[PDB]
Design an enzyme around this catalytic site. Structure first.
Site, short mmCIF file in Angstrom:
data_model
loop_
_atom_site.label_atom_id
_atom_site.label_comp_id
_atom_site.label_asym_id
_atom_site.label_seq_id
_atom_site.Cartn_x
_atom_site.Cartn_y
_atom_site.Cartn_z
N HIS A 196 74.11 35.52 27.95
CA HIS A 196 73.93 34.82 29.21
C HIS A 196 73.51 33.38 28.97
O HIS A 196 72.92 33.06 27.94
CB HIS A 196 72.89 35.54 30.08
CG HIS A 196 71.48 35.42 29.58
ND1 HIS A 196 71.06 35.92 28.37
CD2 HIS A 196 70.39 34.83 30.16
CE1 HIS A 196 69.76 35.65 28.21
NE2 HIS A 196 69.33 34.97 29.31
N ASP B 245 70.98 30.84 31.16
CA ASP B 245 69.90 31.14 32.08
C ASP B 245 70.21 30.60 33.47
O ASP B 245 70.54 29.42 33.63
CB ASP B 245 68.55 30.57 31.60
CG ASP B 245 67.98 31.23 30.36
OD1 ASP B 245 67.98 32.48 30.29
OD2 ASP B 245 67.52 30.48 29.47
N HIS C 268 72.66 32.72 24.93
CA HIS C 268 71.71 33.47 24.13
C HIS C 268 71.65 34.93 24.58
O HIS C 268 72.16 35.27 25.65
CB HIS C 268 70.31 32.83 24.17
CG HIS C 268 69.76 32.63 25.55
ND1 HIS C 268 70.23 31.68 26.42
CD2 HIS C 268 68.75 33.28 26.19
CE1 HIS C 268 69.55 31.74 27.56
NE2 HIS C 268 68.62 32.74 27.44
N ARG D 157 57.64 31.42 27.91
CA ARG D 157 58.75 30.49 28.10
C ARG D 157 58.35 29.39 29.07
O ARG D 157 57.63 29.63 30.04
CB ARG D 157 59.99 31.23 28.62
O1 LIG Z 1 64.45 35.29 23.56
C1 LIG Z 1 64.75 36.20 24.33
O2 LIG Z 1 64.35 37.36 24.26
C2 LIG Z 1 65.69 35.85 25.49
N1 LIG Z 1 65.19 34.83 26.38
C3 LIG Z 1 65.88 34.54 27.49
O3 LIG Z 1 66.93 35.10 27.80
C4 LIG Z 1 65.36 33.47 28.40
O4 LIG Z 1 64.31 32.93 28.07
O5 LIG Z 1 66.05 33.24 29.39
NI NI Z 2 67.82 33.79 28.89
#
Ligand SMILES: O=C(O)CNC(=O)C(=O)O
Ligand code: NI
Ligand SMILES: O=C(O)CNC(=O)C(=O)O
Ligand SMILES: O=C(O)CNC(=O)C(=O)O
Ligand SMILES: O=C(O)CNC(=O)C(=O)O
Ligand code: NI
Ligand code: NI
Ligand code: NI
Lengths: 232, 232, 242, 237
Positions: B71, B73, B199, B214
């Site tokens: 995906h 984001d 990612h 995040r």
């Molecule tokens: O690192 C991860 O586990 C995935 N992170 C994501 O999909 C995000 O931050 O949007």
């Molecule tokens: Ni993500």
């Protein structure tokens, strides 16, 4: 001899072991037991291994002689496992993938089990041409494991479209990231993978850099399906 | 203050910097230049960071605004975020790695027919926003693919065509040679260009709890090669 | 003189025309006109038309030489049209399908036009004919752009096996979609003429192991050219002659 | 009553009978024996049929109750057994209808694909919110033959994800709707089609532009499907 887990369904590092001819039988069996369970195992800091030493270690486990594949499946009796050593690595990239084909089978729905159990594939180099089952019974562990990969040309009694489509369906599950380990190589690393229950893939992401990898392949056996039918 | 390559098509590690608000503008220019070029950049041993210090650092880049499927984001939104600053707070004992993909390189390595296709193609992102499949990056000027798991269908195409084409593009994007897979360790920080990347998390750590802090930044509205904005 | 339409995008029946080698010049134009527009045209009750008479009639239109296909696309200058007459039919089944590849292109999303215009295919027989054709050719006479694919396709140039087969099946799905096809039930003394430069066709093996015979006469065709004006490339084999 | 075959796997025309409520038992037994065998049966030259007369003949077969391949109303559990469709107003050209023999489709599956389908279950929905879980293979109540069960109403297969559902669905539909296993009827005035909905799919063809087309149908009551092992369909909603 400790054994650290790397992934849920595959991979396990092993520490407190110096690979070589001079190894304790019990120590070798623990490596063999760790190999069968985790499907691929890794040894770090093995800077003592030359070609002759790696051959000696392989002699204890068994008998010596990019795209997702199982090694030399176009052959009838394709090898049981390999011992790969890093000797010269690029400054970036050049990792390798492994997939667990045992867990791939286990996590299939019952319809896909019924399918794969009775499905046979034509492996070829694209002139060796073997006819393998898609599910083989592992002789040592007793697990049922998917057998496919890039050497597969078609499925028996199945047209091009259906073969191609089902192949990618099976490969999608096998290679799914949750069912794989991606090993970042370093000097003195040694991988051992059970070829009866794994699939692997090199990653060409080091541009035009040199990368020598001294492998030692072990002798393999002829697969048999759940009913007990050999390849042809 | 060095930056080293991890893969041919993606990935870099920036060593010799302490992440924080204290970093001078010149340091941010090194990070930004590396980030735009290498798409995803990694830092090691950033134990000094918390929530406040990380948020202060993220403010230098822009304006701070299961995931186990490839995906980009928040592409269901129109002005989806530019980049994110993710940090390892607490990890599992094994597994919990993250995948990244370079969608800029993906486009660049398309045959011209597929360039023709994707440039003119539009996707419906939802969990309802119509994005283009190729967007022009507003800093580097690079054309990068825009798809991922939020895509329900392509505009003009039916269910079969949408899926079949969607798989074709994602097969090229998520191709291993076009990806970096990070093994998270304590005090690691990853920054990715959400505009020019894709990612995926990996649930290969059973039922172990994995906490990740995040900080996502403010992003601009996509435009295709013709300069057409994303409808809603 | 009458031209009854069979479908929306393909098919037309033409009555009041006894096919022969002494047909009126204006009558040939009426046939040629319909053949271009309707892609395949049908004639019934042509019991008099034997082999000798069929070749004479074929000479008016042009120059005399199962899976969805365009005939002999492994060759570079593949036929412009054919003239198939029914001589022996089974007791049941044995119909034939036609597809309008001009309408197929016409009803592509702009993305799929963008693709197909720039896409090229390798056609082959496995004699060893191998030819790189443009997927979209410009029809010489009508000037319409038509999709050129079919069973003789092997790969698309620049793409891998997975992409080729994927994209091949996407196009074939649009070409052979029921709304874009005609299905002719053969009766004794029927004749079918199709514009091979704007159609695919397919035999239906739904008559068990029974006898089915039909004599054909093929008209010589030209080497395709893309929208840019690039002739098809020959890898192996020669062009068709006579 | 004569019964000519149309295709090797599907289709048959039946002449020498006028459809109505006052048919002899022997006659109706032949029409049904034909229907079961040939999946769909056609009655040409039936210009005399009223709606009431159509409903009358339908009552002898059972109990009286779109341009994509479908089985009628598979979103319901006890979906119709068969239907009697009649042409009342036809276009100037086109407007043909396709029929597939899902019984023959199953029979010609390789052993692996039988395994798959015999154990596979699908979710049929109406996109009223009738949602039902049917088996992909049902045993036919009358003939005893196993027939594939799918169509446009299938939302997904039980156990499989989105990609796998679509992929495998399209693999089956390709085999079912293969031209060799289909019949394409050209509608003339006063024609009557009768198809075994338990052992077929069908598809309207929008190849008559935007012309007026009227068809009057009398659908018959059907039973719940049961797989090879003998498990009925489950009404989710
Ligand atoms: O690192 C991860 O586990 C995935 N992170 C994501 O999909 C995000 O931050 O949007
Ligand atoms: Ni993500
Ligand atoms: O690790 C790699 O580069 C891949 N190795 C193999 O495919 C092999 O040894 O057969
Ligand atoms: O009409 C048919 O059965 C098919 N004919 C052809 O494919 C042909 O003449 O090339
Ligand atoms: O005859 C047609 O065009 C289609 N008919 C049906 O789908 C039906 O009767 O259920
Ligand atoms: Ni290998
Ligand atoms: Ni032909
Ligand atoms: Ni219907």
């Amino acid at each position: 001899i400790t054994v650290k887990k790397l992934g849920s369904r595959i991979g396990a590092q092993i520490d407190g072991v110096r690979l070589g001819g001079d190894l304790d039988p019990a120590a070798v069996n623990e490596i063999r037991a760790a190999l069968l369970a985790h499907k691929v195992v890794f040894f770090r800091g093995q800077h003592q291994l030359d070609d002759a030493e790696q051959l000696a270690f392989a002699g204890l486990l068994g008998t010596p002689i990019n795209r997702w594949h199982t090694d030399v499946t176009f052959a009838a009796n394709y090898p049981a496992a390999s011992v790969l050593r890093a000797v010269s690595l690029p400054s970036y990239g050049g990792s390798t993938l492994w997939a667990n084909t045992a867990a791939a089978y286990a996590e299939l729905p019952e319809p896909l089990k019924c399918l794969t159990e009775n499905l046979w594939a034509l492996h070829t180099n694209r002139d060796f041409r073997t006819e393998h089952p898609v599910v083989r019974v592992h002789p040592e562990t007793g697990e049922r494991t998917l057998l496919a990969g890039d050497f597969v040309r078609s499925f028996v009694g199945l047209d091009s479209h259906e073969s191609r489509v089902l192949f990618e369906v099976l490969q999608r599950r096998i290679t799914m990231p949750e069912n794989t380990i991606r090993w970042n190589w370093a000097p003195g690393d040694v991988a051992i993978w059970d070829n009866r229950a794994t699939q692997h893939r090199a990653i060409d992401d080091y541009d035009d850099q040199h990368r020598l990898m001294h492998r030692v392949t072990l002798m393999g056996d002829v697969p048999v399906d759940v009913y007990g039918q050999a390849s042809r």
